[PDB]
Swiss-Prot record, chain B:
One of its GO terms (cellular component) is pICln-Sm protein complex. Belongs to the snRNP core protein family. This is Small nuclear ribonucleoprotein Sm D1. It comes from Saccharomyces cerevisiae (strain ATCC 204508 / S288c). Keywords: Cytoplasm, mRNA processing, mRNA splicing, Nucleus, Ribonucleoprotein, RNA-binding.
Curated annotation (Swiss-Prot), chain F:
Its main location: nucleus. Keywords: Cytoplasm, mRNA processing, mRNA splicing, Nucleus, Ribonucleoprotein, RNA-binding, Spliceosome. Residues 3-74 form the Sm domain. Plays a role in pre-mRNA splicing as a core component of the spliceosomal U1, U2, U4 and U5 small nuclear ribonucleoproteins (snRNPs), the building blocks of the spliceosome. The gene is SMX3. This is Small nuclear ribonucleoprotein F. Component of the Sm core complex, present in spliceosomal snRNP U1, U2, U4/U6 and U5. The core complex contains SMB1, SMD1, SMD2, SMD3, SME1, SMX3 and SMX2 (Sm proteins B, D1, D2, D3, E, F and G, respectively), and is probably a heptameric ring structure. SMX3 specifically interacts with SME1. One of its GO terms (biological process) is spliceosomal complex assembly. Pfam families: LSM. Belongs to the snRNP Sm proteins family. SmF/LSm6 subfamily. It is found in: Nucleus; Cytoplasm. One of its GO terms (cellular component) is catalytic step 2 spliceosome. Gene3D superfamilies: 2.30.30.100.
Swiss-Prot record, chain G:
SUPFAM superfamilies: Sm-like ribonucleoproteins. Disulfide bonds: none annotated. Belongs to the snRNP core protein family. GO terms for molecular function: mRNA binding; RNA binding. This is Small nuclear ribonucleoprotein Sm D3. Component of the Sm core complex, present in spliceosomal snRNP U1, U2, U4/U6 and U5. The core complex contains SMB1, SMD1, SMD2, SMD3, SME1, SMX3 and SMX2 (Sm proteins B, D1, D2, D3, E, F and G, respectively), and is probably a heptameric ring structure. SMD3 specifically interacts with SMB1. The gene is SMD3. It comes from Saccharomyces cerevisiae (strain ATCC 204508 / S288c). SMART domains: Sm.
From Swiss-Prot, chain J:
One of its GO terms (biological process) is mRNA splicing, via spliceosome. Keywords: mRNA processing, mRNA splicing, Nucleus, Ribonucleoprotein, RNA-binding, Spliceosome. This is U1 small nuclear ribonucleoprotein 70 kDa homolog. It comes from the Eukaryota. Present with 736 molecules/cell in log phase SD medium. Residues 105-186 form the RRM domain. Component of the spliceosome, where it is associated with snRNP U1. Binds stem loop I of U1 snRNA. Interacts with mRNA.
Amino acid sequence: IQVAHSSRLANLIDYKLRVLTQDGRVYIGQLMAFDKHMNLVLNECIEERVPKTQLDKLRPRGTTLNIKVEKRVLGLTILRGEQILSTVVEDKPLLSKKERLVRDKKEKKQAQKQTKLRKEKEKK
Amino acid sequence: MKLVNFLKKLRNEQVTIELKNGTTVWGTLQSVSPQMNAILTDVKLTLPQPRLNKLNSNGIAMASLYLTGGQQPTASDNIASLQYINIRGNTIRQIILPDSLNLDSLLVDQKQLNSLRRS
Amino acid sequence: AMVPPINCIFNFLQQQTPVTIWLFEQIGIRIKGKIVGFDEFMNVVIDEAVEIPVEKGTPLGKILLKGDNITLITS
Amino acid sequence: SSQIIDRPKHELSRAELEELEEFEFKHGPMSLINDAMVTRTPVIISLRNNHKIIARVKAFDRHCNMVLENVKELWTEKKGKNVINRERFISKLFLRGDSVIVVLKTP
Amino acid sequence: VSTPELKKYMDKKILLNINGSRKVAGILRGYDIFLNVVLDDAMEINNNHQLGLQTVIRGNSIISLEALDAI
Amino acid sequence: PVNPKPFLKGLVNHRVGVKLKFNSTEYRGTLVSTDNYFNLQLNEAEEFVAGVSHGTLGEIFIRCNNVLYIRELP
Amino acid sequence: GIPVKLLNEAQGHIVSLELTTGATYRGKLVESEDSMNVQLRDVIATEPQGAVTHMDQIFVRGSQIKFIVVPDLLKNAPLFKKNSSRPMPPI
Amino acid sequence: MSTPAAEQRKLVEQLMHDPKICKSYLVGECPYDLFQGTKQSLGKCPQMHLTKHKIQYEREVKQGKTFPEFEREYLAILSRFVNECNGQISVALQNLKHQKLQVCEVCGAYLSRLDTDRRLADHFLGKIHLGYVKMREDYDRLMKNNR
Amino acid sequence: RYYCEYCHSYLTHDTLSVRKSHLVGKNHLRITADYYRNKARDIINKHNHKRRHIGKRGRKERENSSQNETLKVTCLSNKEKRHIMHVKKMNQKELAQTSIDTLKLLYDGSPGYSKVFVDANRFDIGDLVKASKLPQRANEKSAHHSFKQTSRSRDETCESNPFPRLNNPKKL
Amino acid sequence: MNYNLSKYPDDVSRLFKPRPPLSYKRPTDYPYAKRQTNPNITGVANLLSTSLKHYMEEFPEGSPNNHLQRYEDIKLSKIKNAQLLDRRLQNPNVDPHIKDTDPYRTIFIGRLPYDLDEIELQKYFVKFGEIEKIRIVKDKITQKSKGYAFIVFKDPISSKMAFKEIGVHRGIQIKDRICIVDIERG
RNA sequence: AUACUUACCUUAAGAUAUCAGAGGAAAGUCCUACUGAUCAAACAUGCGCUUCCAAUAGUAGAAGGACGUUAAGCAUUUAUCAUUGAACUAUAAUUGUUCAUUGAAGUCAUUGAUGCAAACUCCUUGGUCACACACACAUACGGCGCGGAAGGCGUG
RNA sequence: UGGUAUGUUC
Ligand SMILES: [Zn+2]
């Protein structure tokens, strides 16, 4: 997967991130929101960690290393920004960029209609 | 004077960020936030072994490199080559700058010079 | 009636009641002494301070103790 | 001068803030680094991860972050009896300010 | 900024873990906006030795403050 | 009845010993000037990593967060 | 910002939070603050080495939180909507 | 106010005989302070109030060397608000004289008999009503201690 | 400022008292309940298709379909499917609110019954049901409902109801 | 979920049914009491005898701080313009050219046209009083008329009304400009 | 819906690209449907640009899962502390060993945990597009069908 | 010159 060179964390809404924390744990999920303190909200994020028993297979010396990774499933979590260490992008969004544009124009139309209605209703 | 405004001027240059884990991030630098949130692109995370046999290394940062998803499975040393890393600012210990850039052009704060001419 | 902790430190000052100050651990000493003046940041100055390992420890005279370290102030 | 030092910073005007920053760098504790910036003498800086750097200060800052040239990093590594002195030369370096413990001006 | 919501825990016995190991139980008399707390008749649960007649705890070092009473 | 900021203003150009929180390292020296963050500048300072004195140090800037206490020396 | 407001959405619903010491807590979220201080009620508490107990209420200082897990329906909360229009605020 | 550290400094700076010190705060509740939060606030208290004077005053009462002309000063404060709002509640009773409504003096405002006990309990737990209640029973307690 | 996207309404400068008063308001609470009822209804009844990726059938496949036969398709009318989908949605709703509570009926006289099945005297959620009641500020609804509340105490012993069978029970 | 601590009815609170409880995993980091950065930060003075001497033999001269040079250049050019301003202020009584009769009759006019004349502006002042002397100031380096002139009238009351009129009416109509007028003030 | 009653509130400031040049209200300020250069955003628009897009001539396969089964798989390893009495070995206050008694805590698990490995079953995802059933290629390989996805670069 | 909230009356 290739990510745009000028893509800040505001562009990467709905991409699937790979957040790394201080205790060596990786959180993987769809990005929903972020903040000034850099504390995310992740939709289907699944925590992974390397157990202390599997860890010495990572130490520098078969061809490929195989690390059984203890993963827990949690859903719609908010992380805290103090713990976050770095974020990487794993997967693109579901919808295409064109199709995302179509949805956004549609939603702008529907919202403007609803507030026009709410105004003309409060007048009568 | 804030040196973050110095550091924002770099913006397309191969740096090496040495973080507080011990992990070093080598790569082309895109923007830097006002809290020193570096965004690098073509990065090569690596964790230097300590050249003495019995001394291990950071173990938590070994776990952090494997869990990034970019460690080459055949690789002997802890290196992880990954497009687009984003780094929260409090992690950076020091930033190894390139050899070539001239400091005496870059370190001129335009705003300090601005007020000092104005007053 | 509530006593806020500024008021409790100020009562320790005003009655000169001798305090044991628990610093946070991995340092491993405690400061006994009397509180002469305290800060907004909970820096305190201590007259006739003693430091104690974790009751034979050394005396310090009067110190300024930075409040980032202090864990308990007890009497 | 003294009155701007004593007053709380949320009250002070913008020009007073800039004035206080110049005053604390000129007549202050960070004035040490400033003298070594101007007199171009090396400083020894002791970091929080037990590394010692010897370098000249090209610029410094409110948080004690400093741009350094001709940086030389010295460190030692020990396991049991064994100890090794490792040293490294870097040409130009940014140093974030929170790692520093003590900064010494070389005579 | 905003004072913590501990108006319901006043004058009740409370156990809080200072740092990560110590556990101090006392009566909560007052609180600050940093979550400093001053509690009378403290004791350090391990045998458990009493602290003193009046203690303050810097809320930097408090993690959690469960209440061993009615609320 | 002396508060910490007047205590540090009182110790200006007086011998003081600062001990850092790490190794029980202490620097004994004369206090030149102090900040609002209580950054410390010491002149003609000596270094005590234990009771053991290792050397003499010309001028040191001691960063504000590291110091455990500052005491006035005899 | 949005994440702190999402924590305010979850009041009265079972949340699970893991502190920085390692402990896990799952209980109703009674009150939460802009600082992230949370007060859980009827809470099942798992200590770092694994022992589980029951607490009637707990107040955790929000500085110590690693993460909070809220109910799964709240992804449909309206604060996630990008395109949204306001009714022209009054005086 | 802004950052928490700045907020404390104000409190500690306030922690650290009558020319620059108000007496009404030092006896009991300063009636400037009590309904300053609500709409009927006359405004800010013009004489300075400190917590250190309150601790010194608790020390002076606890030692027992009380000085009652201070309480006469405080009673001289209370009489204005008592007589003014008593005139104003008789104005309320005149308006109620000249859909069932009743006038409550102990808040100085209207209630209904039709409303239930919990809404009326809500009104009885107010800044205005409790400032009034501390004001009034303190006034009657000072009067019976004079007599 | 504070704006409630459920209620779609601005308010003045939010203080924790004013905002906390708004969030427990009645109008706000019915509108918020409606919002999540509608979103749960949507994530049930969203009727949207996967993409169909259609492969060219092999000839060896297409002989054996020529053998079997066409098979008849049953399709309802418009009015018929209107009625039948109303009925099916109603069946799923009442089968979702169905709960099995027989074992509470069977133990209705037992000696420790009030402490386990009343659910207000339990030791785990006894305090919580007490806290859950409401402010109950409109008592006109309480006087409009003219039943007796008829609470079971915790202090019951087996002396009351000695012989359960003396006309007191009804059949299962 | 037998009970509801929430504001919502029961049907709404069943919609917020949580996930199952989290499983337990053994920690891989340090327990909270054992966390510390580095203690035994060794001393700084050992460097000062030996390692600093290699550094000075290797890098004897620091590179010049040319970025501070630009701040000092704008400071010193400010000081230089202050000194030239001191000189130009150094070079009234010795003025001579405006040292005709007494300053009570002398009105100044400024921002009048450099390309104006003597006689038309003199008639402009003669509108409001008899003229005794008139004098344009032209730059002694090169004789562009500076746009300022001194007109001494026969009477100071007429010159006062002249200054009033030709300044207070937005600056009197010049050949191509707005000529304010006042007293001499010298 | 109105109205009335109360109760709770009624605010951090400032800014909107940069540098240089000409003009207007000696130092600086402000401004210019002024003018250069740089930057950033949107929208069009291109590159012989780079990667990826599933058998039907067949019963497949690729990518990712399983909080799936075989499965008690196969191999290791774990299941309290203090007091008192009794026998007991012994260089020994009785250190070792066994039985009972009082007190103190005590996540469930031992069909667990941990290490290793394999088979099987099943879920989601995709152009299951068009023309072809073809003798190519050293400058190593017409990248010379239409689309789609994602980036790189350029112009307006 | 306001907002949200509360409950009564019609
Ligand atoms: Zn609302």
